[PDB]
């Protein structure tokens, strides 16, 4: 086996017995991936000073009752991916000082560990994942008052008795993912701080009453279960995380410190008035995919700290966003809905909105304060804090002159808008701020734009269009990438494409009806800078 | 009604359940090793047996009202044209 | 983290009662309970009770996998040809019980055994029946098949599980069947016009038996519930029966997150908690039985059978 | 309406979409060196019902 | 049908829905049935030893 200073890194395969000719001066030993069938006390007790014993991926099935006891300094022991279930008695002797015990994937059984596990007065991280445990009774875990991280995912836990965690007074991180629990009656784990009940089959959740000890839970996960109600969270005043995605929750200051609530893929058909009132100090909210018919955060001072709101794919009809309510909302998502008519200044009242996705909602902007537009419009003009806005798949029949006049946004998308007819000077107040544009698939024919003035423009997207001509370039603008796929251009002038040699790095022509012996300038540009 | 669907989640759960089900029906603690499996295609007898077992062989909500109809008594043309011979009985 | 243990059924029973009331009113297409004051008070006609009594009366470990084995019919030149020579009436098929017992060591292992034929004739329609040899001279009846006309060769399947189990236990060395046309007594002359092979795909048995090496109150289970129209529902417009046993299913069927290696015993949880390997098992009834009632509409009494109302077994998904 | 042929609301209190008809599946797998042909039951789904 | 021996009266029923449907649709003036004893092909006659 490979030998370095106090490390014997045995190779990945080809071993059937523990080597006996190596000296005990080593301190770290590895036996992973070999074909060891059982561990005898004699060759193993020869080594005294060991601090790592990685026995992963073997065929170990029988252990001397006093095999591991003679190792005074054993500080790590991994027995993952073995065959301990076939075992005999005693198993692991009382371990003097072990701070990591790994028994993952040994096909363990309820009542096997209690005859196998011994007292470890310094155990700190226990792992029983990928086993076949089925119950947690009062005698399953005993004599380990230092346990702090218990891993139990991928078991078949279906039932937990009353005091199964009474003998672990200092447990903080617990993990019951991918198990098969079905109900939880109460909660008597004061010091727990990370609880993971994901991917279970839980149907209801509950806590205890008359709290003599303040519960300290902060991280809680309940995704992929079958919860039917929003659990009462007056017994977890320090909760700062929650994940109720893919449940069946229907809604009919206990969370004064909640910080990240996720509530997507549920059945939240409507939002009660008092539900949003107590959820102060929130920063991220996700109501995506929930069937919300309307969002009615009308009360002033509601969600004063909110930084994100996802209302996508809900089939919202209306927004009742009041003024000075969401004073910190920075990112807002509204895609997938069908929003026809809103007050003009719905998005104007927001103080610090930056990104406002409106894909597929069918919301059409209007002219502006002067030269007004049709009724039911939405005013994108007066938002001075916007930076990004996507308006694709909104079927904007007609664009307006000052729809973006006072919105120094650095990114604008308008693709997938068939029959779009763009007014002159529509992108007026964006010349010095707008950096990325997109019009792919509109089907427009002529690009009447103030293109040379878009000094800060970086990339352009005009594919799948019927573009006929473009204003002649007069300088080497900073535009880096240009897209013209599936276009009507068949012969490209060179003088009209003035510059386009320094900054340009990719100018696509693939799929266009270009004809050889008619471009000239294309042959030069293809040679250096961009291909196809 | 409202819905909680994600097709990929259902597909993945179904695939995992299929894995467990196939292992469970054979009462297999762990999948068998293939080290000592002779190479080459299966013996033709095994393939014939598998083909034989594989192919296929030709071998409302709403409540309803009950009514009863008696047979025509043997007093008229029942015994006249079809005597109740020891061979059979007619109705 | 004490898991919920006690189950209280009063709310469950109330929900079941309301659901049953809705089901009863829906199945009859009555948006409301029918008019009752119009009925002629007194005893019911004896004919209606006769009909209701007649309609109310009674007349007339497979989850695991089974190893498959196939045994072919012995060639004609052994026992078939001499004493049981094929005639126009019938075709004789015989099997050697030695290799039969070799395939399935013990009779109790057998789960299903069927006998396969390949018919050659296409057009003529014929009606055929299968017998079993019972001694050196006698025959007995098993079943008959009404062959369908076709244009291509087709295989045939007969279920002969019982006779094969009997052969494995008490049978002699050679046993066989008989395939003869259907002779009504009025049919003086009948012949077997259908042609099958062998008389290269001889008929054979397709034995399925569990292998010898594999020889050996909160879960979903039907729960009793007695519903009374007079007391539980307060209905007087149903005259018979006074009440019926509309027992119901209760129990969760938790999903079992599978692994590539699990304990031997825990595999038995799949069989009773997720047999269908569905993505979200649900405790649903498995066997339903109907209920007939006798209720009045206006002036006329009615005897109606409401279907799929009594729950006999509950199975997860 | 064929989906609701077995609908009994007063038994489960929560109707679920369940398989209605299933078919078996024959497989071939080696136990060490001996080929085995086994037929597993209720493998594929052909139709569904509300119950 | 295979009538098991019995020392008591019993009720037996046959499913004849496919026949009564045709009788209702296009049936004749009077149509009926016939209960007969099984006959083997070996030129054999039988008697109906059942009382109705």
Numbering used by the authors:
A (entry chain I): 26 to 112, 116 to 280, 312 to 591
B (entry chain E): 3 to 61, 73 to 104
C (entry chain F): 1 to 60, 72 to 210, 224 to 240, 261 to 361
D (entry chain E): 311 to 361
E (entry chain E): 156 to 207
Sentences from the paper on this structure:
Transforming growth factor-β (TGF-β1) is a multifunctional cytokine with key roles in development, immunity, cancer, and fibrosis. Latency of mature TGF-β is determined by non-covalent association with its N-terminal prodomain cleaved by furin during biosynthesis. Interestingly, both TGF-β1 and -β3 LAPs contain the integrin binding motif RGDLXXL/I and bind to two integrins, αvβ6 and αvβ8, which together account for the majority of TGF-β1, and some of TGF-β3 function, in vivo.
To address mechanisms allowing TGF-β1 to bind to TGF-βRs without release, we use single particle cryogenic electron microscopy (cryo-EM) to study complexes of L-TGF-β1/GARP and αvβ8/L-TGF-β1/GARP in solution. Thus, while we determined structures for both 2:1 and 1:1 αvβ8:L-TGF-β1/GARP complexes, we focused on the 1:1 complex obtaining a structure at 2.5Å resolution. Thus, binding to αvβ8 not only stabilizes the RGD loop and part of the arm domain that binds to the integrin, but also allosterically induces more flexibility in distal regions of the L-TGF-β1 ring, particularly the lasso loop and straitjacket. Applying this concept to explain dynamic allosteric activation of L-TGF-β1, our results lead to a hypothesis whereby, upon binding to αvβ8, conformational entropy in L-TGF-β/GARP is redistributed from the αvβ8 binding site to the L-TGF-β straitjacket domain, allosterically exposing mature TGF-β to TGF-βR, leading to signaling. For L-TGF-β1, lower basal conformational entropy results in less entropy redistribution towards the lasso domain, insufficient to release mature TGF-β but sufficient to expose it to its receptor.
